[PDB]
Amino acid sequence: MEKKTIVLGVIGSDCHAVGNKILDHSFTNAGFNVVNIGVLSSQEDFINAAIETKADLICVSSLYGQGEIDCKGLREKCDEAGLKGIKLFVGGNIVVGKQNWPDVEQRFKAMGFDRVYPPGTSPETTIADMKEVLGVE
């Protein structure tokens, strides 16, 4: 929970990475470690490196630009009950929704250990990245 490990990346077509947008600065604001992959959706590949670095949380810079891979990727990592990564502050993740998610995160509402930053947030919300996840939920 206070593990120094933040694996960040993804994003689709949007300049380059307006998510990169120093969410890694929040690393510093968490006294955590950096595990920037890039703009890939390395599931089972960075899951092998999630044992390595010991990914505490995952920060996606995409509102579904990772598929059902990253969706039931970390949910499967919970359901793994071996790989630690039950904290997923998934930036963007599904547009036109906040709290009230469709049938998709209806089942992942029950899980709902993953929060999302609504489209139109700020890096001010990333100060709140590791403020809530490290604090209490």
From Swiss-Prot:
Family note: Belongs to the methylaspartate mutase GlmS subunit family.
Keywords, ordered alphabetically: Cobalamin, Cobalt, Isomerase, Metal-binding
Cofactor or coenzyme needed: adenosylcob(III)alamin
Protein name: Glutamate mutase sigma subunit
Annotated binding of adenosylcob(III)alamin, by residue: S13, D14, C15, H16, A17, S61, S62, L63, N93, I94, V95, V96, G97
Record-level GO BP terms: anaerobic glutamate catabolic process; glutamate catabolic process via L-citramalate
Reaction(s) catalysed by this chain's protein: (2S,3S)-3-methyl-L-aspartate = L-glutamate
Transmembrane regions listed in the UniProt entry: none
CDD domains according to UniProt: Glm_B12_BD (cd02072)
Origin species: Clostridium tetanomorphum
Primary role: Catalyzes the carbon skeleton rearrangement of L-glutamate to L-threo-3-methylaspartate ((2S,3S)-3-methylaspartate).
Domain (B12-binding): residue spans on this chain: 3-137
EC number: 5.4.99.1
Domain of life of the organism encoding this protein: Bacteria
Subunit text: Heterotetramer composed of 2 epsilon subunits (GlmE) and 2 sigma subunits (GlmS). GlmE exists as a homodimer and GlmS as a monomer.
